[PDB]
Design an enzyme around this catalytic site. Structure first.
Site, PDB file in Angstrom:
ATOM      1  N   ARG A  44       4.665   3.217  -7.000  1.00 49.62           N
ATOM      2  CA  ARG A  44       3.530   2.367  -6.661  1.00 49.62           C
ATOM      3  C   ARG A  44       2.655   3.034  -5.593  1.00 49.62           C
ATOM      4  O   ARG A  44       3.048   3.165  -4.430  1.00 49.62           O
ATOM      5  CB  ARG A  44       4.032   1.003  -6.172  1.00 49.62           C
ATOM      6  CG  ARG A  44       2.942  -0.008  -5.817  1.00 49.62           C
ATOM      7  CD  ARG A  44       3.552  -1.384  -5.539  1.00 49.62           C
ATOM      8  NE  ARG A  44       2.599  -2.328  -4.940  1.00 49.62           N
ATOM      9  CZ  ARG A  44       2.370  -2.466  -3.630  1.00 49.62           C
ATOM     10  NH1 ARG A  44       3.019  -1.731  -2.730  1.00 49.62           N
ATOM     11  NH2 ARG A  44       1.480  -3.360  -3.210  1.00 49.62           N
ATOM     12  N   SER A 101      -2.932   1.366  -2.292  1.00 51.29           N
ATOM     13  CA  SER A 101      -4.281   1.779  -1.884  1.00 51.29           C
ATOM     14  C   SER A 101      -4.531   3.293  -1.921  1.00 51.29           C
ATOM     15  O   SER A 101      -5.662   3.751  -1.728  1.00 51.29           O
ATOM     16  CB  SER A 101      -4.596   1.237  -0.490  1.00 51.29           C
ATOM     17  OG  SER A 101      -5.973   1.354  -0.195  1.00 51.29           O
ATOM     18  N   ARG A 131     -10.525 -10.821  -7.187  1.00 53.09           N
ATOM     19  CA  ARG A 131     -10.668  -9.793  -6.158  1.00 53.09           C
ATOM     20  C   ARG A 131     -12.143  -9.465  -5.874  1.00 53.09           C
ATOM     21  O   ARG A 131     -12.476  -8.942  -4.812  1.00 53.09           O
ATOM     22  CB  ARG A 131      -9.884  -8.530  -6.554  1.00 53.09           C
ATOM     23  CG  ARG A 131      -9.282  -7.793  -5.367  1.00 53.09           C
ATOM     24  CD  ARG A 131      -8.640  -6.459  -5.755  1.00 53.09           C
ATOM     25  NE  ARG A 131      -7.198  -6.413  -5.496  1.00 53.09           N
ATOM     26  CZ  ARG A 131      -6.248  -6.794  -6.349  1.00 53.09           C
ATOM     27  NH1 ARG A 131      -6.556  -7.272  -7.547  1.00 53.09           N
ATOM     28  NH2 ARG A 131      -4.970  -6.700  -5.993  1.00 53.09           N
ATOM     29  N   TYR A 171     -13.235  -2.696   5.915  1.00 51.34           N
ATOM     30  CA  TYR A 171     -12.311  -2.426   4.821  1.00 51.34           C
ATOM     31  C   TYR A 171     -12.391  -3.568   3.817  1.00 51.34           C
ATOM     32  O   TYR A 171     -12.193  -4.726   4.182  1.00 51.34           O
ATOM     33  CB  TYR A 171     -10.887  -2.272   5.368  1.00 51.34           C
ATOM     34  CG  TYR A 171      -9.885  -1.695   4.392  1.00 51.34           C
ATOM     35  CD1 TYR A 171     -10.188  -0.570   3.629  1.00 51.34           C
ATOM     36  CD2 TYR A 171      -8.621  -2.259   4.252  1.00 51.34           C
ATOM     37  CE1 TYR A 171      -9.273  -0.036   2.745  1.00 51.34           C
ATOM     38  CE2 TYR A 171      -7.695  -1.729   3.369  1.00 51.34           C
ATOM     39  CZ  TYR A 171      -8.027  -0.619   2.618  1.00 51.34           C
ATOM     40  OH  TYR A 171      -7.110  -0.085   1.739  1.00 51.34           O
ATOM     41  N   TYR A 202       7.450  -8.610  -8.245  1.00 50.80           N
ATOM     42  CA  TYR A 202       7.869  -9.366  -9.423  1.00 50.80           C
ATOM     43  C   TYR A 202       7.294 -10.778  -9.420  1.00 50.80           C
ATOM     44  O   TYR A 202       6.739 -11.226 -10.425  1.00 50.80           O
ATOM     45  CB  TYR A 202       9.397  -9.429  -9.526  1.00 50.80           C
ATOM     46  CG  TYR A 202       9.887 -10.325 -10.648  1.00 50.80           C
ATOM     47  CD1 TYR A 202       9.932  -9.870 -11.965  1.00 50.80           C
ATOM     48  CD2 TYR A 202      10.295 -11.627 -10.395  1.00 50.80           C
ATOM     49  CE1 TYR A 202      10.375 -10.690 -12.995  1.00 50.80           C
ATOM     50  CE2 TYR A 202      10.738 -12.453 -11.415  1.00 50.80           C
ATOM     51  CZ  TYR A 202      10.775 -11.981 -12.712  1.00 50.80           C
ATOM     52  OH  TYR A 202      11.214 -12.810 -13.724  1.00 50.80           O
ATOM     53  N   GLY A 220       0.031   1.448   0.680  1.00 49.64           N
ATOM     54  CA  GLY A 220       0.922   0.377   1.128  1.00 49.64           C
ATOM     55  C   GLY A 220       2.303   0.820   1.558  1.00 49.64           C
ATOM     56  O   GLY A 220       2.620   0.764   2.745  1.00 49.64           O
ATOM     57  N   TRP A 264       3.454  -1.139   5.557  1.00 46.38           N
ATOM     58  CA  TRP A 264       2.666  -0.028   6.080  1.00 46.38           C
ATOM     59  C   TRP A 264       2.823   0.063   7.603  1.00 46.38           C
ATOM     60  O   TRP A 264       3.101  -0.936   8.264  1.00 46.38           O
ATOM     61  CB  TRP A 264       1.187  -0.209   5.717  1.00 46.38           C
ATOM     62  CG  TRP A 264       0.286   0.720   6.456  1.00 46.38           C
ATOM     63  CD1 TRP A 264      -0.430   0.441   7.576  1.00 46.38           C
ATOM     64  CD2 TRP A 264       0.034   2.093   6.150  1.00 46.38           C
ATOM     65  NE1 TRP A 264      -1.123   1.550   7.985  1.00 46.38           N
ATOM     66  CE2 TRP A 264      -0.856   2.581   7.129  1.00 46.38           C
ATOM     67  CE3 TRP A 264       0.471   2.957   5.143  1.00 46.38           C
ATOM     68  CZ2 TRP A 264      -1.323   3.897   7.131  1.00 46.38           C
ATOM     69  CZ3 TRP A 264       0.002   4.266   5.138  1.00 46.38           C
ATOM     70  CH2 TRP A 264      -0.887   4.722   6.129  1.00 46.38           C
TER      71      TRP A 264
END
Length: 404
Positions: free
Chosen positions: A64, A67, A164, A179, A249, A357, A381
């Site tokens: 994964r 970002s 989003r 950001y 999940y 992340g 993070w």
């Protein structure tokens, strides 16, 4: 190996042995194409398999990126610019008339009513890629926090707007560095300019040139790399011990392509992107275009306030392993060091950096001729042993490489 590198390598193996980290992939490349440093430590999970072993992190282990996807989408955006589909200072309202129609959230009354307002000035592709469009992530801004609590983002469904992309801006373009969901918009820019969904673009225009076959948005449609995918592990804030993280999940990310996050890949393939950009080989991007990614894009006032913001917020720590207080700008794709992080010992002035992340950090250092990648799968993070280990990683290979 060298003296500093064997000490670092031991520092990493002790963190795996003493249960501090689950595992890590560590990679470093030269512009000259003859540094091939890549080591792997520990596991890709804390969950023991049917065999009662911890299956090891490895260079092709699907991970994964979170970002760290933003860099890939910056390349796709810049690829479209090279091809004359967009221009950096072209108003976005041709390809993104839905973004261009969004208002800016000014504030609230004493009655608590939201004051929306027309945007002053136009948004450009350069604004998106430098986080200067004026839009924020909802959970960061106190105005968007309340705006969300009032329930005004709930109507996005009705007009078919994606969650989003739903929030209004908090400022005008070129006012602040903030950001936000800029690469989710840039991703849409790419899709509608080219006529392909991001995933097919990524495959055709990033994976194919570098010979990658383990980089995708659609992890569910790739059973072979799903079978040996890394798991997420979370560090407990109480006792500092690490546990299995099954938050992904219950979220149900579920086959939804956006440019800000979502891509799974092997660390080896991600270093292949960093490597191409470093040596100007032209397979992803025209060298002149790459030069732009390392150019301070921010105006003096914007960079001054971007430094203020970052220096004043150590709990987020955008500049991960770099010095907490440091003079930075932003180029196209990440944070730029406006000074040598420690004389000749470490990253040089003009080096580009951003992360992801699960404590993923990458950097490209043209002047030093090096690029490094520190790959973990561990939340949150800004984790201290990850940050520290990464710090000892970079220092060690910069030392071995440049003198002696």
């Amino acid at each position: 190996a060298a003296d500093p590198v064997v000490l670092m390598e031991t520092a990493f193996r002790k963190a795996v042995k003493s249960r501090q980290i689950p595992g890590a992939v560590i990679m470093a490349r030269d512009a000259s194409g003859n540094l091939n440093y890549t080591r792997c430590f520990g596991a890709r999970t804390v969950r023991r398999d049917e065999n009662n072993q911890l299956p090891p992190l490895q260079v092709d282990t699907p991970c994964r990126l979170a970002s760290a996807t933003k860099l890939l989408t910056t390349i796709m955006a810049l690829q479209c610019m090279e091809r004359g589909l967009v221009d950096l200072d072209e108003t976005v309202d041709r390809l993104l008339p839905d973004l261009s129609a969004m208002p800016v959230l000014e504030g609230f009354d004493d009655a608590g009513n939201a004051r929306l307002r027309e945007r002053r000035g136009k948004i450009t592709l350069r604004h998106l890629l430098t986080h200067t469009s004026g839009l924020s992530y909802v959970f960061l801004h106190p105005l968007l926090r309340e705006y969300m609590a009032q329930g005004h983002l709930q109507s996005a469904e009705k007009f078919g707007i994606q969650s989003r992309l739903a929030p209004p801006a908090v400022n005008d373009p070129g006012a602040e560095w903030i950001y936000g969901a800029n690469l989710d918009w840039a991703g849409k820019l790419v899709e509608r300019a080219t006529g392909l969904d991001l995933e097919q673009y990524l495959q055709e225009n990033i994976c194919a040139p570098l010979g990658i076959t383990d980089m995708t948005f659609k992890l569910q449609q790739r059973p072979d790399m799903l079978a040996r995918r890394a798991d997420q592990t979370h560090r407990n804030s109480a006792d500092g011990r690490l546990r299995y993280d099954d938050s992904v999940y219950f979220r149900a990310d579920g086959e939804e392509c956006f440019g800000g996050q979502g891509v799974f890949s092997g660390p080896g393939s991600y270093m292949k992107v960093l490597h191409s950009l470093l040596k100007r080989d032209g397979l992803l991007l025209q060298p002149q275009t790459v030069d732009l990614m390392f150019q301070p894009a921010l105006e003096p006032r914007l960079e001054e306030q971007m430094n203020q913001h970052m220096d004043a917020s150590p709990h987020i720590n955008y500049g991960g392993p770099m010095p907490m207080v440091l003079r930075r700008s932003f180029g196209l794709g990440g944070i730029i060091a406006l000074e040598d992080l420690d004389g000749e010992n470490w990253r040089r002035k003009g080096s580009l950096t951003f992360g992801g992340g699960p404590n993923i950090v990458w950097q490209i250092d043209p002047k030093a001729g090096l690029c490094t990648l520190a790959f973990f799968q561990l939340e949150p993070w800004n984790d201290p042993v990850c940050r520290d280990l990464t710090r000892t990683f970079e220092h060690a290979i910069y030392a071995q490489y440049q003198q002696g």
